[PDB]
Amino acid sequence: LTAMGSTIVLYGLGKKQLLRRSVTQTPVSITKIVSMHQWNYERLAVGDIHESVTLFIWDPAGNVFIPYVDDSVKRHVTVLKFLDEATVIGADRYGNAWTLRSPPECEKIMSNHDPSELSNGAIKYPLDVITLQQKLPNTYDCKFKFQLLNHFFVNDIITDFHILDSLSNSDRPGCIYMGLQGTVGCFIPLLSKGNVFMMGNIENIMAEADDTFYLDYESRKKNNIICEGSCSILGRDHQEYRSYYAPVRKVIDGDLCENFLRLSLNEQEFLAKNLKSVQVEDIIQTINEVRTNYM
Amino acid sequence: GNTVYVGNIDPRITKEQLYELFIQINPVLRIKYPKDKVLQAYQGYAFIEFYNQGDAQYAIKIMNNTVRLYDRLIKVRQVPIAKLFIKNLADSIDSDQLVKIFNKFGKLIREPEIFYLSKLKCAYVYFEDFEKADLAIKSLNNQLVANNRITVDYAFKNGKGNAKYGDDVDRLLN
Amino acid sequence: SRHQFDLIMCLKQPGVQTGLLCEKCDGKCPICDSYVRPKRKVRVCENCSFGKQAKNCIICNLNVGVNDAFYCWECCRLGKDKDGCPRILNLGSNRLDRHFEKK
Amino acid sequence: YIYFITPLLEDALTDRDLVHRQTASNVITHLALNCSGTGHEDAFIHLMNLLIPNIFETSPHAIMRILEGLEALSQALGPGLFMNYIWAGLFHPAKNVRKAFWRVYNNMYVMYQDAMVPFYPVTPDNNEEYIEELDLVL
Amino acid sequence: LNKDEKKERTLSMLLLKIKNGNTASRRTSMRILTDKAVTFGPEMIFNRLLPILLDRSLEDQERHLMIKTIDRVLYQLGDLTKPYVHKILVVAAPLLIDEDPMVRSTGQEIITNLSTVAGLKTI
Amino acid sequence: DELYLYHLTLKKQTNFVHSCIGHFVDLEAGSKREQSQLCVATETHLELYDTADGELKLIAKFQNLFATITSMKSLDLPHWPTFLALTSDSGNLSIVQIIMHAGALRLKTLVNQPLTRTTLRRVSPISYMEIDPNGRCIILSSVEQNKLCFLVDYAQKLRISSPLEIIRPHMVTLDMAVVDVNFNNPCFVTLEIDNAATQLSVHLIFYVLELGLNHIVKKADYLVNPSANFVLSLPDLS
Amino acid sequence: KPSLSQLKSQVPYPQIIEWYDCDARYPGLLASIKCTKNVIPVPSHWQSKKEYLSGRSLLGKRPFELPDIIKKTNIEQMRSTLPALDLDYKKLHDVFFKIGANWKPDHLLCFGDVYYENRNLFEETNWKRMVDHKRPGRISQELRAIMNLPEGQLPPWCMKMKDIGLPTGYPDLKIAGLNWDITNLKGDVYGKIIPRNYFGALISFETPEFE
Amino acid sequence: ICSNKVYNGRRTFERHFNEERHIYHLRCLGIEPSSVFKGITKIKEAQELWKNMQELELEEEDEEGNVMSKKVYDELKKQG
Amino acid sequence: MAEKQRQLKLQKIYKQKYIGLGDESTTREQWQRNVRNDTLNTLQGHSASLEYVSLSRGDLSIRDTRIHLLKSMSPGYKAYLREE
Amino acid sequence: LSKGENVPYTFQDEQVRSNPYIYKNHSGKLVCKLCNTMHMSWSSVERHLGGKKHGLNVLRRGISIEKSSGSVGLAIQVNYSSEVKENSVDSDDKAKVPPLIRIVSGLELSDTKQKGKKFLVIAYEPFENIAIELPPNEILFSENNDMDNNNDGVDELNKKCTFWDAISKLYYVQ
C-alpha cells in the first residue's frame, strides 16, 4: 500500500515490473500523505502534511477506499497508528501527541453495513447529518468527525509509536513513543476510574505547589520558597505548558507526579495536608506503582 | 421527486403521528407540516420527504386512499416558446384553419389564440422553433388569405426575436 | 479599571518594585478588580516609582499604600499579568465629580 | 457542575433581552478558565455555538463581557478549534463584520502568538511567499 | 439665518443645562455635545463657551462642568486653530497653580490633550 | 467510555543546547574552589558534570523542569559560588543557584523577574542572553523589537536593577555576542537585519550601556555585506 | 471586480461563494479562506437590521425546565415558582457525583452549528427522541385509536402490500401473514425487522465518595 | 438567462434561483440545476462554469503485460 | 464614547508590543507578512523544529538553518539568493 | 392602571381577556403579540393600544381573516329597545345604518374547541351580537328572486332577504 502525494495506490507483484492493482483519489483537502497505517486489512488511517488525518475502508468489489471520517482541526502529522479499531494515536511536527476516536454514531453504521454501500447506494443518514453537509460543504464533507480523545504536549517531535500489548508481563498495554531529540516515553492507560482520581489529585497537588508554598510564606509573614516560582524553578504553570497548542485532555502527567519523590519529607507532608485522603507513604506507594507493576 | 403530498389531514394530527404512520411504509427524511403561526393551526396537508424517488412512489401507491385518521381518508399524491402576433385576419379564418396554415411552416407547441383589438381580428401562434417561426414570417408576412391581407410578426413581451432570444430558444429546443 | 472607563493604565516594562494598595482598595486585582484568589505580586515600572507617587495606591493613586498588590489567578491564566505596569494615571471622571459637588 | 448548567446557560444566551446574554457570558468566562483542560470541551463547543452570533452586538457592557467569554472559551477549545469560527469573517466585504472579527482576532493573537502558527489558513497558492520549509518531510 | 440661528440657541441651551441644570438634565446634554461637537462650529462652541470661564461669579462646581466640556470637545475635533489655543491657555493654565490637586490635575489633563490636538509647532 | 492516559518520560531528551562553565556547588571537599565544573541544559532537561579528574563525571541530574529553556549562562559576580542565569519560556529571567540540601543536590531559585508573556514568541526577550564578563549586568534580546539589560548587584541578598530598554522597531537580530571590558562600561555587539526593506542589508551595531546616565546608547553602526553570519569579541589589543 | 462566475471557478466548493464576496477588497483571498478545510462561515444575521434577537420566535419561548436528574431531587414541589427545605445532604451529593456522574445533556451541539435566530432546539431534540422510539412494524395505542386499528388486526395497507410487495426501503421487514407467521400479529406488533474494549476499557468504575 | 426578464425586488430575484422556469432554462440549456450555479445570471458565464463541472495494470502472461490495461487483458481473455 | 476611545489607545499600545495585530483595513500583503514571520520564529525557536528542518534540507550545520530562517524574515532575501 | 385584569403569561395555554393580545413573556415584560412590541409598564401599553401601529396590525389581521375562513325556509324576528336607552345617543353616527347579518363558520371561536357548523350572526351597534346554528347545508337559498337590481348594500344576502322596520325597531330575516 503505497501513497503517492495526493493519491493512494495499491501494488501487487508481477514479473518484469510491479503493477497497479488499485488506485484511489483522495478527497480535496489532502495534498500529501506523510504517514499511514492500517487495521487488520479492514481499515486505513491516512495522515497529511497540513490537514489532520482521515480514516478509510477497504471495499472489495469496488476496488477502492472510501472515506468515512475526517478531523476538525489542522494537525501536521509525523506519525500515526491504531491503538484500536475505532481509535488512533498520532504526533505533530509541533510536539503535540494526540489520540482521536471515531464517534459511536459512525460505529453503529460501520458495524451494521457492508462497505460497498457507503460510496453510493442507501445508507440512511440521520436528518441532522445531511443538513450539516449542505450547510457546511467544506467542513463536514466525510461526514462525521473524530472526537479528540487525548491531547498532550511533549516538546519533542515524535517519530515512532510502538503499541505494545504488554511490557515485561505487565497487564496494562502501553504505547512507548520515541522522539527526534532522543527520548522514550510512554503512554500507559489507567484502568480504574478511582485510580486516575488518586493520580489526578496528586498531579493537582504538585502542579501548583510553587503557589501554595508562596501563599503560606506570605500569610506566615502577615501573622507570626521566597520566590513565586520556587517549586517550579521557573515561572511556568504546568497546565499552561503542557497545554500549549491546545488543552490537555485526559493525559495525566506522570513525570510531574514523580517529582514528589524528590522532595524532603517536610515538604511532602506539607503538600499532602490538602487531601482528606491517604498519607504521604500511600502517595509514594501509588506513584511508585506504575514502574513496578505497569511496566 | 422524493417528496409526496399528504391531504385530508384532521388538524388534531401531530407531526409525530404523521412520522409514526409513514415510517411504517418507508424511511422518512423529513416532514414539513405547514402551520398558520397566528392561530397555531395545522392546515390539512403535509409534505413527506423520503430519501429517494422509488421510496416516495411506493408510498403513494400503498397509502393513497388506504388509511382513515379521525375517520378521514388520507390522500397521498406526487408533487419559453416562439409566439407570433398576426393582425388583420379574416372572419372566415377558423382556429383549426390557422393550425393547418402554420403546420406546414412549423410544429405548434400550443393552439392559436384569437382575439379582437380596436373589430380587428388578431391571433397569437406558438411555434416550437424560432427558425420555423422565421419561415412562417418570411412567407406569410403581408400576405392575402381569405381575400384579406394579414401581417405576421413577433408578439410583444419589447417584441420577441431578440439576440438572446435566438440563443436561449435554440437551447430550449436542444 | 474594569468598570470605570476613562482611566488610563501605564503599560510599560515592569521593573523590580511592588505596587501598593490602600486599606480601601486592599485585596483587589488591579485588572479585573476582583477580591478573590490572588496569585502573583504586581510589579510596576521605575517611572511609577520615585518619590511621593510610589506610596499611593496603584488604583486610586490618591490614598497612601500599605499592602502589596497581587494579580488574581484568573488574570494570570489569561496573561493580563504580564502586559505591563498596571498603574492608573489619571484620577478619572467619577472621583472628580464627587469632589466638586461636595465642595 | 458543568453539564448541569449548559442547559441553564442555554436559555440565557438564547434569550431576547440583552442582559441575560451578558451575565451568562460572564459565567462562561469563569467557567471556562478554570475548567479548561478537564475534558469537557463538548459543552464548550455548545456554549460557543451560542455565543459567536453575539459578536456583532453593541452596548459597551454587553460586548466586553462577550469578548471576555470568547477569550476564555479559547482556552477551553484551543486556538485551532476556536479560530475556525474566526478566519472567515476576518476579511469579508462588510467593514463591520470585518471590524468585529478583528477585535476577537487581536485578543487571540495576544494570548497566542506562537500557538497560532500551525493553524493559519495558508497554502502555497493562497499567498505569494508561503514558507517552503513547512512542506519538507524527513 | 433663522434656521442656523436655531443652532445658536441649542448650544447656548446645552451650555446652560450643563452649567446650571438638573443632574438628569446635564447628563443628557453632555451626551449631545460629545456626539454633535463635530457638526457645531468649533468657532461657535469656543467663542460661546470660553467667555463664561472669565467671569468672577462662577462657583467651583460650575467651573469644572465647563472645563469638562472643553476636555470632551478637544478630544474629538483634533484640528484646532491658533486663535483659540491662545484663549484656551488663558483659561486652562491658571488651574495649574490652583490650591488643591484635584483642580491642578484636571487643568493638566487639558493641556496634555491640547498639546496633541494643536500640535507642536502651534503652541 | 473515555481513555485516560499516564505519561512517563523514560529516557530524557539528549540534545544539549546550552552550557555554562563555572563552580556551582562545593561538594565532598570542606574547602575547594576550582572553575572546573559544568552545567549543561536542553530545553526541558538540565545536568551537572564535573572535571579535574581528567574525565567528565556526572554529579547530578535535577528535577523535571516543565518549561522551555531558551538560554543559560553562568554569572560570576564579585563578592561566592556561581549561579546560572537562566531564561526561558514564561518570560522570566530566572537566576538559579544549584545547592546542596537534604542529602542530594537541588536546584534553588533566587530571582525570577517578569518579562513579556508566556510562549516562545518573537518579540519576547529571550533566545539571546549574554553576560558582562565581570558580572555587572545581564543583557537579553529578542528577535525583532526589544532588548533589555538588567543590572546585577550582590548584597546580603542578590539584587537586580529595573531593566534598561532599547526598542528598535523593525530590526530582527542575529548573533548578540558581547565585548569584555575592564570595568569601563559594558558593551555588546549585534548583527541586526532590517525586517522591512526592499533589499537585504544586515548591519553590525555596537551598544554601550552608560553606567553614569544609566541608559543604553548606540555607538557605531556599520553596514556589512549580506552574507554576515556571526560575531565574536577580541579581548584588548594591548 | 471579478464576476462571481470568475470567482467560483477558483474554488473547490463553488457553492459557498455569494454575490457580495465579489466586492471584498481581496476576493481572491477571501474565497480561498472561506473554502478552506474547516472554516466556519460568519454568522448570517449581519445585514439584518433586526438586532439579532427580535421577537417573532422569542415571543413564544417556554420558561425553563430543570433537567430530569435534578427534578428527581423533589425541589420542584418544595418551592413552587410558577406562576425549611429538609433537604438531605447525602442525596444531593450523589445526584451530581454518583448517580449523575456521566449524565450529559441530550443534544448539545456539534462543531459547526451556529445558532441562527429562528432555530429552536426543542423541536430538534424531540425529533431525535422520535426517530429512535417510533418504528416500522409497531403502532402505538394512540395512533391505533385514531386509525381504528385494534391490537391483533393487520393494518389496512396489508392487501396492497400483498399485491405490490414489501417496502422498497425495508428488505428485512417481516409482516405477519405475508412473510412472517400470522401468529406474530400480537398486541401492538404486526411486523419486525429481522436480518472491543477500545484499549482503554476501565474495567472498574468508582466515583469520589463524600464520607 | 430568463427572457432578459425584469425583477422588481432583490429578495424576489434571490428567490428566482430556485424556480421552475429558471431551472428549465438551466437544465434545458445543458447546465444542470441546484446550488452551485445559484448566483450568476448571464447565460455565458455558467457555460464555462459547467465546463468546469464536467489506469491499472493486469499483467499478461508473457511478463510484458505489466503495461497492459485491465479491460485490454479482459479482451485478451475473450481472445484467449 | 469614553470607552470606545480607550479602545483605540490600547490598540496602538498592544500593536507596538506584539507587532502584528491587524485592525480592520489590513492589506493582505500586510497580514501575510506577520503570518510569515511567526512561522519563521517558531521553526527556528523550538529545538525540535530546527533539527527537523535542518536534516530535511540537508543543511551542513543546524546553525546555518537558523540563519536561513532569520534572513527570510527580510523581504530581500529571495532576491539575494537569486543573485548568487 | 390594569383595571384589575389578569394579563396572562405567554406559556399558560388559554375568562375572556379584556382585549386579547397583551401578554407577559417568560420574563416579566409585557408584549403585544400582534405588533411584537415590548413594553415597560401598563402605562406604556395603553399608549400602544391607543397608537397608530396597533391600529394597523388589527386591520391587516382584519383583511387576512376576511380573505379566508317550493321548499322550506327560516324566519327570525328580532326586537329592539323601546326608546329606553337610545335617548342619549342621537348624533347621526351610523344611526341610519340598519342591523347587519353574516354567515360565519364555527372554525374560528374565542375558545376553539368544537366546530363544523354555520351561524347566521346578526349585529347592531349598541346591542350584543346574536347567532343561529344552521346544520342544514342549504335552506331557502333561492335562485334569482328579484330581477337583478344592483344596490349591493352590504351583500346579496342582506338586500335579498332582510327587512328593517326602523319605525318599530323590528328586524326580520328570511
Using an 8 Å CB-CB cutoff, list chain D residues near F122.
Answer: 113
Distance CA A247, CA D81 (A): 11
Contacts 24+ apart (CB under 8 A), D18-23: D18/D57, D18/D59, D18/D62, D19/D62, D21/D54, D21/D57, D21/D62, D21/D66, D21/G53, D22/D61, D22/D62, D22/D65, D22/D66, D23/D65
**Cβ contact (<8 Å) for F200 and I70?**
no
Using an 8 Å CB-CB cutoff, list chain F residues near A189.
Answer: 3-6
Q: Counting Cβ atoms within 10 Å, is residue F183 exposed (0-12), middle (13-18) or buried (19+)?
A: exposed
Closest to A72 (Cα-Cα) out of A170, A168, A140, A161: A140
Question: Which residue, among B12, B23, B28, B71, would best test binding to G if mutated, counting the most G CBs under 10 Å from its CB?
Answer: B23
Closest to D104 (Cα-Cα) out of D69, D62, D59, D78: D69
I touches C, CB cut-off 8 Å, minimum 3 pairs: yes
Tell me if C47 sits within 8 A of C98, measured CB to CB: no
B120 and B166, same structural domain? yes
- 3-state DSSP call for residue A110? helix
B86 and B72, same structural domain? no
Using an 8 Å CB-CB cutoff, list chain J residues near G62.
Answer: 11, 26
Phi-psi region of D130 (alpha: psi -120 to 50; beta: other; left: phi over 0): left
Tell me if C15 sits within 8 A of C50, measured CB to CB: no
Closest to F95 (Cα-Cα) out of F135, F123, F122, F61: F135
Closest to F203 (Cα-Cα) out of F165, F231, F179: F231
For chain B, how many structural domains are there in total?
Answer: 2
Residues of J with CB under 8 A from a CB of G: 9-12, 23, 25-26, 31, 33, 36-38
**Cβ contact (<8 Å) for H63 and A22?**
no
Tell me if F5 sits within 8 A of A250, measured CB to CB: yes
**Cβ contact (<8 Å) for F121 and I70?**
no
Using an 8 Å CB-CB cutoff, list chain C residues near D109.
Answer: none
**Helical (H) or strand (E) element with B158:** none
Quoted resolution (Å): 3.9
Using an 8 Å CB-CB cutoff, list chain I residues near E35.
Answer: 1
Distance CA A238, CA B96 (A): 93
Q: Does A155 touch chain F (CB under 8 A)?
A: yes
Question: Is beta strand J170-173 parallel, antiparallel or unpaired with respect to J76-79?
Answer: antiparallel
B84 and B69, same structural domain? no
Contacts 24+ apart (CB under 8 A), A258-267: A258/A287, A258/F8, A258/F64, A259/A206, A259/F63, A259/F64, A260/A202, A260/A205, A260/A206, A260/A284, A260/A287, A261/A287, A261/A288, A262/F63, A262/F104, A264/F101, A264/F102
What length is written for chain B?
174
Using an 8 Å CB-CB cutoff, list chain A residues near H67.
Answer: 17
Distance CA F187, CA F219 (A): 10
Among residues B32, B64, B79, which one ends one of the domains? B79
Surface of G (108-127) touching D: CB under 8 A: 108-111, 113-117, 121
Closest to F2 (Cα-Cα) out of A71, A193, A106, A90: A193
Question: Which residue, among B22, B29, B58, would best test binding to A if mutated, counting the most A CBs under 10 Å from its CB?
Answer: B29
Distance CA D128, CA D111 (A): 27
B24 and B75, same structural domain? yes
CA E123 from chain centre, in angstroms, equals: 18
Distance CA B100, CA B125 (A): 12
Chain E residue closest in CA terms to I6 = E75
B111 and B156, same structural domain? yes
**Cβ contact (<8 Å) for G111 and A72?**
yes
Surface of J (1-40) touching D: CB under 8 A: 25, 27, 29, 38
Closest to D71 (Cα-Cα) out of D57, D56, D55, D60: D55
**Cβ contact (<8 Å) for C96 and E60?**
no
Distance from CA of H23 to the nearest CA of B (A): 11
Surface of G (14-53) touching I: CB under 8 A: 25-26, 29
B158 and B119, same structural domain? yes
List, edge to edge, every strand of the sheet that includes A18-24.
A2-3, A8-13, A18-24
Measured CA to CA in angstroms, residue G162 lies from F160, F198, G150, G159 at distances of: 95, 84, 21, 5
What does the block give as the cell for A8?
A: 493512494
**Cβ contact (<8 Å) for B67 and G164?**
no
Crossing angle (nearest 10°) for helices I62-71 and I28-45: 160
Using an 8 Å CB-CB cutoff, list chain F residues near I51.
Answer: 15
Chain H residue closest in CA terms to G8 = H49
Question: Is beta strand B45-50 parallel, antiparallel or unpaired with respect to B28-32?
Answer: antiparallel
Using an 8 Å CB-CB cutoff, list chain J residues near D16.
Answer: 25, 27, 38
Using an 8 Å CB-CB cutoff, list chain I residues near F43.
Answer: 46-47
Using an 8 Å CB-CB cutoff, list chain D residues near I18.
Answer: 109-110, 113
Distance CA D9, CA D23 (A): 9
**Cβ contact (<8 Å) for C91 and E105?**
yes
B92 and B50, same structural domain? no
How many other CB atoms sit within 10 Å of the CB of residue B107? Answer: 11
Q: Does I28 touch chain G (CB under 8 A)?
A: yes
Question: Which residue, among D45, D73, D84, would best test binding to A if mutated, counting the most A CBs under 10 Å from its CB?
Answer: D84
Distance from CA of E102 to the nearest CA of C (A): 7
Distance CA G185, CA G167 (A): 18
How many other CB atoms sit within 10 Å of the CB of residue E39? Answer: 7
Calculated CA dihedral for residues J3, J9, J10, J15, nearest 10 degrees: -60
Tell me if D64 sits within 8 A of G130, measured CB to CB: no
Distance CA C85, CA J28 (A): 45
**Helical (H) or strand (E) element with G110:** none
- 3-state DSSP call for residue D70? helix
**Cβ contact (<8 Å) for E102 and C101?**
no
What was the structure determination method?
Answer: cryo-EM
Chain A residue closest in CA terms to H69 = A20
Q: Which chains touch A (3 or more CB pairs under 8 A)?
A: B, C, D, F, G, H, I
Nearest to C101 among E61, E106, E109 (CB): E61
Q: Does C14 touch chain F (CB under 8 A)?
A: yes
Measured CA to CA in angstroms, residue G58 lies from B37, D8, J34, J107 at distances of: 13, 17, 13, 28
- 3-state DSSP call for residue I84? coil
**Cβ contact (<8 Å) for C77 and D71?**
no
Tell me if A153 sits within 8 A of F14, measured CB to CB: no
Query: Residue A158: CB partners within 8 Å, gap ≥ 6?
Result: A78, A79, A91, A97, A177, A178, A179, A180
Closest to C56 (Cα-Cα) out of C66, C69, C71, C43: C66
Please, how many CA atoms are within 13 Å of residue A142, restricted to the half-sphere of its CB?
25
Distance from CA of E2 to the nearest CA of C (A): 37
Query: Residue A3: CB partners within 8 Å, gap ≥ 6?
Result: A9, A33, A36, A46
**Cβ contact (<8 Å) for J26 and G56?**
no
DSSP H helices, B71-112, are 95-103
B158 and B87, same structural domain? yes
Distance CA B135, CA A97 (A): 77
Distance CA F163, CA C43 (A): 12
Distance CA H31, CA B174 (A): 12
B137 and B97, same structural domain? yes
- 3-state DSSP call for residue E8? helix
Nearest to A250 among F5, F89, F94 (CB): F5
Q: Does G44 touch chain H (CB under 8 A)?
A: no
Closest to I49 (Cα-Cα) out of A96, J147, H57: A96
Q: Does G205 touch chain D (CB under 8 A)?
A: no
**Cβ contact (<8 Å) for F65 and A258?**
no
Distance CA D54, CA G52 (A): 8
Please, how many CA atoms are within 13 Å of residue E66, restricted to the half-sphere of its CB?
24
Q: Does H40 touch chain G (CB under 8 A)?
A: yes
B86 and B43, same structural domain? no
Q: What is the DSSP letter of A133?
A: H
For chain I, how many structural domains are there in total?
Answer: 1
- List residues bridging with F140 in a β-sheet: F129, F148
What length is written for chain I?
84
Q: Which chains touch F (3 or more CB pairs under 8 A)?
A: A, C, D, G, I
Closest to D103 (Cα-Cα) out of D45, D41, D60: D60
Among residues B42, B60, B79, which one ends one of the domains? B79
**Helical (H) or strand (E) element with G47:** none
B87 and B57, same structural domain? no
Nearest to A211 among C39, C41, C77 (CB): C39
Residue position matching grid coordinates 441532522? A128
Task: State which residues form the domain around B156.
Answer: 80-174
Residue position matching grid coordinates 509541533? A94
Distance CA A184, CA A295 (A): 13
Using an 8 Å CB-CB cutoff, list chain A residues near D77.
Answer: 246-247
Calculated CA dihedral for residues G156, G157, G159, G162, nearest 10 degrees: -150
Chain E residue closest in CA terms to I2 = E72
Distance CA A196, CA A250 (A): 10
Nearest to C74 among D33, D110, D111 (CB): D33
Question: Which residue, among C99, C102, C103, would best test binding to E if mutated, counting the most E CBs under 10 Å from its CB?
Answer: C99
